[PDB]
Amino acid sequence: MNYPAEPFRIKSVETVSMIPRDERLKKMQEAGYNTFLLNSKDIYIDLLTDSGTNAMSDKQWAGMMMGDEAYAGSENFYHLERTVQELFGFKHIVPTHQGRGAENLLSQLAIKPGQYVAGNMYFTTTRYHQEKNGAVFVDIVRDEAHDAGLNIAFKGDIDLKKLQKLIDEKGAENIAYICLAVTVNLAGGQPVSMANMRAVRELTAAHGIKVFYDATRCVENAYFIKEQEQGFENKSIAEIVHEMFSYADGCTMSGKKDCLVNIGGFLCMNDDEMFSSAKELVVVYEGMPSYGGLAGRDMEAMAIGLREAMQYEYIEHRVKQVRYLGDKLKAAGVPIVEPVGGHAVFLDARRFCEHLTQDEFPAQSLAASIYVETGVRSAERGIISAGRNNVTGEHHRPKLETVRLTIPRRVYTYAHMDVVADGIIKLYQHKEDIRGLKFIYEPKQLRFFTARFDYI
Amino acid sequence: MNYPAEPFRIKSVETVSMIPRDERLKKMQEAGYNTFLLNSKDIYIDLLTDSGTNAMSDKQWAGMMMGDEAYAGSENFYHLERTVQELFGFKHIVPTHQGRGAENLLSQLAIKPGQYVAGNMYFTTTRYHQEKNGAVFVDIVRDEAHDAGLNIAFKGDIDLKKLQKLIDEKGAENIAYICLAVTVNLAGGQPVSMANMRAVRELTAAHGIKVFYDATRCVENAYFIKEQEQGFENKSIAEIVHEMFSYADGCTMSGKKDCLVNIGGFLCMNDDEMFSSAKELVVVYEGMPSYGGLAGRDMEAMAIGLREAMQYEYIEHRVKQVRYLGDKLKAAGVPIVEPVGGHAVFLDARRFCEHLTQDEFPAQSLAASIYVETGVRSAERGIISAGRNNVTGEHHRPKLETVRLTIPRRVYTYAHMDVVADGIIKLYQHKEDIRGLKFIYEPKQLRFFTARFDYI
Amino acid sequence: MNYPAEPFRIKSVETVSMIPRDERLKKMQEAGYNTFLLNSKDIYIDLLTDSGTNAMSDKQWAGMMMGDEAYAGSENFYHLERTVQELFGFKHIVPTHQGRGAENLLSQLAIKPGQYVAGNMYFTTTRYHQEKNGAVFVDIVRDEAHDAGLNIAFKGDIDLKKLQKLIDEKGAENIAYICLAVTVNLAGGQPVSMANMRAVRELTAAHGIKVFYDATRCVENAYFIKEQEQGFENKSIAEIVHEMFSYADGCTMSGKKDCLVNIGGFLCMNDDEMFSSAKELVVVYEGMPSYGGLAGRDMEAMAIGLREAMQYEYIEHRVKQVRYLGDKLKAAGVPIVEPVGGHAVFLDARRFCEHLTQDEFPAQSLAASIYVETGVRSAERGIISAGRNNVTGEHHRPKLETVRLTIPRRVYTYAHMDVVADGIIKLYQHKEDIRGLKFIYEPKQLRFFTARFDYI
Amino acid sequence: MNYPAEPFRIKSVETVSMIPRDERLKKMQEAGYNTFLLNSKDIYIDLLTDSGTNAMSDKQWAGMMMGDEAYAGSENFYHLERTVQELFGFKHIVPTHQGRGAENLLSQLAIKPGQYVAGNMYFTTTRYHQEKNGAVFVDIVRDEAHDAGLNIAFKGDIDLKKLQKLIDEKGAENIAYICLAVTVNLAGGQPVSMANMRAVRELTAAHGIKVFYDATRCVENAYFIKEQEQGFENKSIAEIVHEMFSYADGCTMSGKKDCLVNIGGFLCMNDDEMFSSAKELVVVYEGMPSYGGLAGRDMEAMAIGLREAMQYEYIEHRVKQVRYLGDKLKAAGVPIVEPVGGHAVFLDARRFCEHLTQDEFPAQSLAASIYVETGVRSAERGIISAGRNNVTGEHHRPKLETVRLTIPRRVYTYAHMDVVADGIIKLYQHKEDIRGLKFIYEPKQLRFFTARFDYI
Ligand SMILES: CC1=C([O-])/C(=C\[NH+]=C(/Cc2cccc(Br)c2)C(=O)O)C(COP(=O)(O)O)=CN1
Ligand SMILES: CC1=C([O-])/C(=C\[NH+]=C(/Cc2cccc(Br)c2)C(=O)O)C(COP(=O)(O)O)=CN1
Ligand SMILES: *Cc1c(COP(=O)(O)O)cnc(C)c1O
Ligand SMILES: *Cc1c(COP(=O)(O)O)cnc(C)c1O
Ligand SMILES: [Cl-]
Ligand SMILES: [Cl-]
Ligand SMILES: [Cl-]
Ligand SMILES: [K+]
Ligand SMILES: [K+]
Ligand SMILES: [K+]
Ligand SMILES: [K+]
């Protein structure tokens, strides 16, 4: 209905190139049919992740010239701190070099073994850090989130009856915290409504339960709220973002997503004692409370980017660029998760590869075939990424078996999207040629980053 | 492909203001309805010129960090010198801060007063430096080049009969040189064939006449040759460039055009004694022969960009992006100069606004309307820019009353082109509503730069 | 020459300023009398640490423009990898965001709880990661390293008899590894001889014991070998470095020291299995095996800086600039650790404050006093940094109770060193006025980074 | 005997080669014993000029990432405009790519055939543009300026009697303007007093005569005023600069000197009519009035740097670093121009090599020897640069036969100065071994840059 032009100009460029199909085939076999193991120079359009692949602005790069590299008390730390305090409203901030650094801190601090962490689906590293510290993870997202072809708004919402049932069955004091993610990545980058955030806050508060947001794509989320939730039409993105976090006790953020940077994240909290504990731990893994495993210039760039993300036209274009790709795939009949989310289009590999069972890793193989036929790199987001259940030793078997076409922010154009859509539409015409995979090498956790496979 | 995807990704972005229509209207009126008085900060898409507005590459910006700022013997100078010798095949090079710096040097070195300089049309600064040093300019472009709507290939070609005629009516000894421009800006960015460059070289050499290229858009020109001149389909852009200059005795270059930089130019020649004399003169106006009024980093950026310009996919996309805008305008019935040239689309503001007389400044108001409706700045290239006749006091009346949509290299997308086209097309549907202008402040010189207007 | 000029020019600058004494006193109080808690903007000359505070080169800032920010397979990773393979000679490399990220990995991978890690003294984070994974740390440095005034060469050498005794008493199978640090920071930056490294490799290999170097100041170390170990005087820094690591099974390194960067580190090993295991773990804490919690641009800068550090004139100047500062203090009677080490001058606070006992934290108070009187920040390196013995709950009581005047690489001049020395000399004249401190806030590990104190 | 520490620390370094003496001799030979022909890569300490060789700040480099490269109405133009209007107090500013571009403009604008332009000595390019436009030059500096060893304050002052004399003999209507330079370069960097600027303005104003400054080293000049002129002890650098230009009708500025940039200049004036004419001409030679042959980023850097220059500690250190080298040379008995100027030390090569006559080029040979012995490049500033008087074909015979040790701003340390001094002193102690030179290649004009020599 609307695909706006880029609300910015190109200031500098990076060359892209395609290698022949025959070379891509060798590369893909070299990589054990795992797109995560391919090499950057062999990729033409790199949709592996929107993590840390974003284009910075001229103002960010100006800040990159103004790094105060002091070991302690860098002025760039104070700019970051004031910016996050202003925009998110949390009392305290601890920088980390990226998101999983903050998850490591939060999980060590806030989980006793045997407690439960509940959330609206999960991100791989987030769940791993919860479980590594002794938590049992419980999925409390609404059922609709797991239905790929279901086109409803705010699919990321928590089901308050699931949360209430967990409380009734396990007791509030045995829930370490709720991890509320905005947006919800596995559902396709699906937003959570303000009404749901408020409802979750009221119920958890009544039971003394803490709520930490996974804030990684919170600006994308705020845009969906402005666009679709009644009563927010006229509120600014910044106001919506500030209200969202008013319903939380803290957050983990990978700045490498919505803060428009190549590195960076942080942990926020309102509680003073937790803040003191977090500082005692940040020095073990990351660095000082005033740099957290980041150079000063990166704290600067992250401060500037988070503020830039609040510009309405930027985030509207960001999200509608993704929608353009998904709209084009859907109009051609390629099966995708719906509605399109904020950061990626998720192909529905279960439908794309109906000739394979999920045990033959259709998402992983489709990702491989897309690179072979198009030079586009995408991510597996199904049974491989979901990992092994620690308790049963068997695959987690998510209902969503998808391939993620993940869009870095401010990097590509609509013409690049057309390339991506065309090549996937042409692969769809011979989708029965996609072969099942088996493991030849499986890491003990987060296996999808470096596992190797062979064709069945 | 008609319209290829960009053969690069965005490395960094330039922040723009997405100023709405009501505010653009206020800004346009405060500019005296003169786009030259607009502030850059208030412009979304700036098509005033392709000069010095290009986006550099990551490699060029790496070069910007390696500026050897020494007054003499800079490594960056030696890199520029080697690059230009390699790619253009001239013996000697003298850097200048931009094209008209080299034009100053060439016209002082190579023109004895009274001599003739003949070229395929002309450019403002180039002709001015010729005439300033006593030359008489003669236009030897083919008659077709002055027919704005005639769509023929290699429209910038010289008419060899005109050059022969000049030689017989004036004598070769009285011709300082032939100024062969590639492309021809005033015809709309029209290319010159290799066959024509060969023919021109042959005739002149037979009479001892020198040929200096105005080379500012030589790479665009090279693309047209690869695309459309029989025999060159399989030659690389570099091979075409090197052959082109092999038919010249030297050149003046604005790096600000096809060397993909924001400042920079140079003078090349093969003659040892002209070179000695250029090195004396460059000290007067520009700088040392080893930096030419450029920072070392800029010599570096220009060395790198000129070589990046040789990449086929880059220049193909550069030219086809301009063609896309022009094609889209032409399909909607918008009157343009044809065929579309390499760097810009020229709107025929006379036909656009037939209901206005030339004295009511149709090009100038159309330009103003374009900004109001889209945030796009465009250049009046008609009666206002032609200046006033001071002997008679009436306007100089240009044959071409145009608005120039000049496209910087690697800055904009096809979606920006759609903003431009869509907005001009809507203005075309209501062309009768475009109001004439009248002066309210007219300076005596450079009136295009600071004049102010009110609607009649 | 005893004090060579800088083997480089200044490319860009950062202003320095001093706030008045009365304001510094307030700042010192607000900081709990812990220099680690002061803010950068309040520091005149910041000698807190040489960690990450280095000035990068033009070549490094060129690489900073060439960040390939791909999530997997960045070109910058492969540059780092081949640079470290070339210069250190290890088979495999895993990037980490800095040194303690590498330490986390090594200690988790190579320690069975109950085993011993033996080393020539220790760095705080290194030992903490050893202990938190269940090792007992054993100091096997030669006795002389603990004798502040004893001016002998290669104070950092392991005592082979101490190592053999540990083997005899505890069994080789109960030794997780030997952590051999080059230089040895706590002894004052004291080098290890190539003969010692050889002897250690011969003994350990016969017992099946692995040796991992803490390579963080290995280039400083190499310089001392070149300067003072007979038969190396005309070998290149690079040769020496490569031979040093030929005696190791791997290493941890903080690039923020001798790789001349503001962020960055890595883990190296020769063993194939351990490498596979390291990659399974890097994704939990840091990131992919091909970015390790760094931006692409940072792997690039680190690759470039490590190679720059091999330049003899650079490392000669670096080390002799520290010596200059130590020579000036010593000549004026200020007590220092001797001989001066590679990266810092260590004030002997035991002799500076003979009126205080070590239980009164003379080093912590001397660092506070230096800042208040001069605006120079320096680090406690005594009883506070030594930490708390977790078994008995008592302070570790190091013989060395020192203050570290830590020199960032390529940042300051000899004139700055003169200012530092003059201010400390003047303080020493009223040394009796320095008051003892006591804890008011003690973190549970690594307490020196954020502890707060008050005067006794 | 105050030599302050640098009021900045090193943010980034420039890589340098330090080739040994035997290779420097080889290079010096290949260069024809002319230091202007040496390559930058072969020089350790490059004191050829303070022009465009300065180190910029982090703030300037952040400005470099904020280049608004628009052809008209760039934010960087507006920032430069308001900054110069503010700090110099002129009504109108026209940017130019460097000083001699502005001189071209001023001389074309303000000189009528046959008029006189009188100044306190002259600079090469400034006087050339004056004469080229029909002016007759007249030196009205005080006679003292020409006496090298005369150590008096404000040596650049104009002699009011000579000005009154010129007026009486020639008539004020035949004087185009007084060209007053601050500092006076050819006298050795000698300052002009506020008293003299005031008196010059008074006398000229009495006769309706214009005064235009050469402002290139106006900040250095302001420092001398602050340090030494009674009435200005308590005035800031900025207040002094602003008062200085209040005694002028306009100025030409090379930003490559006291604006702390690598490229840039401008033309200032108060007269509305001359401004309009200057805007007409700037288009011919430089660019639009809105960029003047500069990239937007450079207008930015120059705007930032002019303001930085006003910082007392910066300019105090700048001047006292030059003074340090001069004082060390004079204490060793090396003959120099006195007092030491703002930007350079001038060796008196006449006395240094009193065994040679001027016609044997003692300054040129000394410069050669300085480089061979230290890797310092310096500028011949004597008979060779004076040039031939080609009316007669003989050498011009300046009273000042000098070698200029020209100090770029913020690039070097006092340790570098010691390198320079130590080597020159060693040379001085066997100054008889310096061999005379003779032309083997002389150009007709500007022989300083390309002439080549051999030992007699
Ligand atoms: C063919 C050709 C050129 O195209 C060219 C640059 N073209 C301009 C600049 C420009 C010049 C005057 C007024 C305006 Br309005 C705008 C443009 O905007 O099209 C030059 C000069 O080169 P230079 O600008 O580097 O000195 C020489 N020959
Ligand atoms: C007083 C004063 C100057 O000193 C000056 C430049 N001064 C140089 C450069 C320089 C070096 C060698 C030959 C030449 Br010829 C020139 C120097 O080394 O001292 C200029 C021109 O400014 P510009 O260089 O920006 O055009 C105007 N006035
Ligand atoms: C990417 C991500 C993370 C982890 O962030 P990193 O910076 O990659 O460690 C956590 N949660 C979500 C929802 C993410 O997308
Ligand atoms: C600085 C240091 C470390 C830790 O590295 P970080 O990058 O600070 O985490 C480890 N060992 C030694 C000897 C060090 O000096
Ligand atoms: Cl992922
Ligand atoms: Cl000149
Ligand atoms: Cl420390
Ligand atoms: K520009
Ligand atoms: K740092
Ligand atoms: K990245
Ligand atoms: K320069």
Coordinates of C-alpha atoms in Angstrom, one line a residue, chain D residues 117-395:
Chain D
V117 CA 50.5 48.3 -3.6
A118 CA 52.7 48.9 -0.6
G119 CA 53.4 46.3 2.1
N120 CA 55.7 45.2 5.0
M121 CA 57.9 43.1 2.7
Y122 CA 56.1 40.6 0.6
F123 CA 55.3 37.0 -0.1
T124 CA 56.0 35.3 -3.4
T125 CA 52.4 34.6 -4.5
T126 CA 50.8 37.7 -3.0
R127 CA 53.2 40.1 -4.8
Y128 CA 53.0 38.1 -8.0
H129 CA 49.3 38.5 -8.1
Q130 CA 49.7 42.2 -7.3
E131 CA 52.1 42.8 -10.2
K132 CA 50.3 40.5 -12.7
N133 CA 47.3 42.9 -12.3
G134 CA 49.4 46.0 -13.0
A135 CA 50.6 47.0 -9.5
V136 CA 54.0 48.3 -8.7
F137 CA 55.2 46.9 -5.4
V138 CA 56.8 49.1 -2.7
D139 CA 58.3 47.8 0.5
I140 CA 57.4 50.0 3.5
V141 CA 58.6 47.7 6.3
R142 CA 60.9 49.3 8.9
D143 CA 64.5 49.1 7.9
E144 CA 65.2 46.9 11.0
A145 CA 63.3 43.9 9.5
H146 CA 66.2 43.3 7.1
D147 CA 68.8 42.8 9.8
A148 CA 68.9 39.1 10.7
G149 CA 70.6 39.4 14.1
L150 CA 68.7 42.4 15.3
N151 CA 66.6 40.9 18.2
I152 CA 63.8 43.5 18.5
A153 CA 60.1 43.1 19.1
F154 CA 57.5 43.6 16.4
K155 CA 60.0 43.5 13.6
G156 CA 57.3 43.3 11.0
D157 CA 55.9 46.8 11.7
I158 CA 55.4 49.1 8.8
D159 CA 57.5 52.3 8.9
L160 CA 54.9 55.1 8.9
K161 CA 57.4 57.5 7.4
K162 CA 57.8 55.4 4.3
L163 CA 54.0 55.2 3.9
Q164 CA 53.7 58.9 4.3
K165 CA 56.5 59.3 1.8
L166 CA 54.8 57.1 -0.8
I167 CA 51.6 59.1 -0.3
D168 CA 53.5 62.4 -0.8
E169 CA 55.4 61.3 -3.8
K170 CA 52.8 59.2 -5.6
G171 CA 49.4 60.6 -4.5
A172 CA 46.9 58.5 -2.5
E173 CA 44.6 58.0 -5.5
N174 CA 47.4 56.1 -7.2
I175 CA 47.8 53.6 -4.2
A176 CA 45.6 50.6 -4.7
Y177 CA 46.0 49.4 -1.1
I178 CA 48.4 48.7 1.7
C179 CA 49.1 45.0 1.9
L180 CA 49.8 44.3 5.6
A181 CA 50.9 40.8 6.5
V182 CA 50.7 39.2 9.9
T183 CA 53.2 37.7 10.6
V184 CA 55.8 38.7 8.1
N185 CA 57.2 35.4 6.7
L186 CA 60.2 36.7 4.7
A187 CA 61.5 38.6 7.8
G188 CA 61.5 35.3 9.7
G189 CA 57.9 35.1 11.0
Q190 CA 58.0 38.5 12.6
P191 CA 55.0 40.0 14.2
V192 CA 53.3 43.3 13.8
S193 CA 52.1 45.3 16.8
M194 CA 48.5 46.4 17.3
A195 CA 50.0 49.9 17.7
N196 CA 51.3 49.7 14.1
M197 CA 48.0 48.3 12.6
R198 CA 46.2 51.1 14.4
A199 CA 48.6 53.8 13.1
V200 CA 48.5 52.3 9.6
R201 CA 44.7 52.4 9.6
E202 CA 44.7 56.0 10.8
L203 CA 47.1 57.3 8.1
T204 CA 45.5 55.4 5.2
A205 CA 42.0 56.4 6.3
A206 CA 43.2 60.1 6.3
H207 CA 43.9 59.6 2.5
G208 CA 41.0 57.3 1.6
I209 CA 43.4 54.3 1.0
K210 CA 42.4 50.7 1.5
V211 CA 44.2 48.2 3.7
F212 CA 44.0 44.5 3.1
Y213 CA 45.7 42.0 5.4
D214 CA 47.5 38.8 4.6
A215 CA 46.1 37.0 7.5
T216 CA 47.9 33.6 7.0
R217 CA 49.6 33.6 10.4
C218 CA 47.4 36.1 12.2
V219 CA 47.0 33.8 15.3
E220 CA 50.8 33.5 15.8
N221 CA 50.9 37.3 15.5
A222 CA 48.1 37.6 18.1
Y223 CA 50.2 35.5 20.5
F224 CA 53.2 37.9 20.2
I225 CA 50.9 40.8 20.9
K226 CA 49.5 39.0 23.9
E227 CA 53.0 38.1 25.2
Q228 CA 54.9 41.3 24.5
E229 CA 52.7 44.4 23.7
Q230 CA 51.7 46.5 26.6
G231 CA 48.0 46.8 26.9
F232 CA 47.2 43.2 25.9
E233 CA 48.5 41.2 28.9
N234 CA 44.9 40.4 29.9
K235 CA 43.2 40.2 26.5
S236 CA 42.3 36.8 25.0
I237 CA 43.8 35.6 21.7
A238 CA 40.3 35.9 20.2
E239 CA 39.9 39.5 21.3
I240 CA 43.3 40.4 19.8
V241 CA 42.6 38.7 16.5
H242 CA 39.2 40.6 16.3
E243 CA 40.8 43.9 17.1
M244 CA 43.6 43.3 14.5
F245 CA 41.2 42.9 11.7
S246 CA 39.1 45.9 12.8
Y247 CA 42.0 48.0 11.3
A248 CA 41.5 46.4 7.8
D249 CA 39.1 46.5 4.9
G250 CA 39.5 42.8 4.2
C251 CA 42.0 40.0 4.1
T252 CA 43.4 37.0 2.2
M253 CA 43.9 33.9 4.4
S254 CA 45.7 30.6 3.8
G255 CA 43.9 28.3 6.2
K256 CA 46.7 25.9 5.6
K257 CA 48.6 27.9 8.2
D258 CA 46.9 29.2 11.3
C259 CA 43.4 27.5 10.7
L260 CA 45.1 24.1 11.5
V261 CA 44.1 22.4 8.2
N262 CA 45.7 20.6 5.3
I263 CA 43.8 22.6 2.6
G264 CA 41.7 25.8 2.5
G265 CA 41.5 29.6 2.4
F266 CA 39.3 32.5 2.1
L267 CA 38.8 36.2 1.1
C268 CA 37.1 38.6 3.4
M269 CA 35.9 42.1 2.8
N270 CA 33.5 44.7 4.2
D271 CA 32.5 46.4 0.9
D272 CA 29.2 45.1 -0.5
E273 CA 30.2 46.0 -4.1
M274 CA 33.6 44.3 -4.0
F275 CA 31.9 41.2 -2.5
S276 CA 29.5 41.0 -5.5
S277 CA 32.4 41.3 -7.9
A278 CA 34.4 38.7 -6.0
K279 CA 31.5 36.3 -6.3
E280 CA 31.5 36.8 -10.1
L281 CA 35.2 36.0 -10.2
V282 CA 35.3 33.2 -7.7
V283 CA 33.2 31.1 -10.1
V284 CA 35.9 31.5 -12.8
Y285 CA 38.8 30.2 -10.9
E286 CA 37.7 28.4 -7.7
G287 CA 34.0 27.4 -7.6
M288 CA 30.7 28.7 -6.4
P289 CA 30.7 31.3 -3.7
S290 CA 29.2 28.5 -1.5
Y291 CA 32.3 26.3 -1.7
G292 CA 35.2 28.1 -3.4
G293 CA 37.1 25.0 -4.6
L294 CA 36.7 23.3 -1.3
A295 CA 34.8 20.1 -0.3
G296 CA 32.2 20.7 2.3
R297 CA 34.2 18.6 4.8
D298 CA 37.2 21.0 4.4
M299 CA 35.1 24.1 4.9
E300 CA 34.0 22.3 8.1
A301 CA 37.5 21.4 9.2
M302 CA 38.7 24.9 8.6
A303 CA 35.8 26.4 10.5
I304 CA 36.6 24.2 13.5
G305 CA 40.3 24.7 13.3
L306 CA 40.2 28.5 13.2
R307 CA 38.3 28.5 16.5
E308 CA 40.7 25.9 18.0
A309 CA 43.6 28.2 17.1
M310 CA 42.2 30.8 19.5
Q311 CA 43.0 28.6 22.5
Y312 CA 45.8 30.4 24.4
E313 CA 47.6 27.2 25.5
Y314 CA 47.6 25.8 22.0
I315 CA 49.2 28.9 20.4
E316 CA 51.5 29.5 23.4
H317 CA 52.9 26.0 23.0
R318 CA 53.0 26.3 19.2
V319 CA 55.2 29.4 19.3
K320 CA 57.3 28.2 22.3
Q321 CA 58.1 25.0 20.6
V322 CA 59.5 26.9 17.7
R323 CA 61.3 29.1 20.2
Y324 CA 62.8 26.0 21.9
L325 CA 64.5 24.9 18.7
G326 CA 65.8 28.5 18.1
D327 CA 67.0 28.9 21.7
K328 CA 68.9 25.5 21.6
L329 CA 70.5 26.5 18.3
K330 CA 71.5 30.0 19.6
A331 CA 72.9 28.6 22.8
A332 CA 75.3 26.4 20.7
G333 CA 76.4 29.5 18.7
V334 CA 74.5 28.6 15.5
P335 CA 73.6 31.9 13.7
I336 CA 69.8 32.4 13.2
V337 CA 67.4 35.1 12.3
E338 CA 66.3 36.8 15.5
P339 CA 64.0 37.0 17.3
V340 CA 62.6 33.5 16.5
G341 CA 59.5 33.8 14.4
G342 CA 56.0 32.3 15.0
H343 CA 56.3 29.3 12.6
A344 CA 59.9 28.6 11.9
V345 CA 63.6 29.0 12.8
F346 CA 65.8 30.5 10.0
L347 CA 69.4 29.5 10.0
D348 CA 71.7 32.2 8.7
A349 CA 73.5 30.1 6.0
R350 CA 75.6 33.1 5.1
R351 CA 77.3 33.0 8.4
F352 CA 76.9 29.2 8.9
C353 CA 79.0 28.8 5.7
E354 CA 81.1 32.0 5.6
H355 CA 83.7 30.0 3.6
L356 CA 81.2 30.1 0.7
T357 CA 79.9 33.2 -1.2
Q358 CA 76.2 33.5 -1.9
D359 CA 76.8 32.5 -5.6
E360 CA 77.9 29.0 -4.4
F361 CA 74.4 28.5 -2.7
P362 CA 75.3 27.9 0.9
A363 CA 71.7 27.7 2.1
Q364 CA 70.9 25.1 -0.5
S365 CA 73.9 23.0 0.4
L366 CA 73.2 23.4 4.1
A367 CA 69.7 22.1 3.6
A368 CA 71.1 19.2 1.8
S369 CA 73.6 18.4 4.5
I370 CA 70.9 18.8 7.2
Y371 CA 68.9 16.0 5.6
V372 CA 71.8 13.7 4.9
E373 CA 72.8 14.0 8.6
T374 CA 69.4 13.8 10.4
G375 CA 66.6 12.9 8.0
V376 CA 65.2 16.4 8.6
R377 CA 64.0 18.3 5.5
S378 CA 64.2 22.1 5.5
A379 CA 63.6 24.8 2.9
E380 CA 66.2 26.9 1.1
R381 CA 65.1 30.5 1.7
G382 CA 67.9 32.5 0.1
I383 CA 69.5 33.3 -3.3
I384 CA 68.0 30.2 -5.0
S385 CA 64.4 31.0 -4.0
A386 CA 64.9 34.7 -4.6
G387 CA 65.3 33.6 -8.3
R388 CA 67.0 35.3 -11.2
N389 CA 66.4 38.9 -12.2
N390 CA 65.8 37.8 -15.8
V391 CA 65.9 41.4 -17.1
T392 CA 69.6 41.1 -16.5
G393 CA 70.0 37.3 -16.4
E394 CA 71.9 37.4 -13.1
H395 CA 71.0 36.0 -9.7

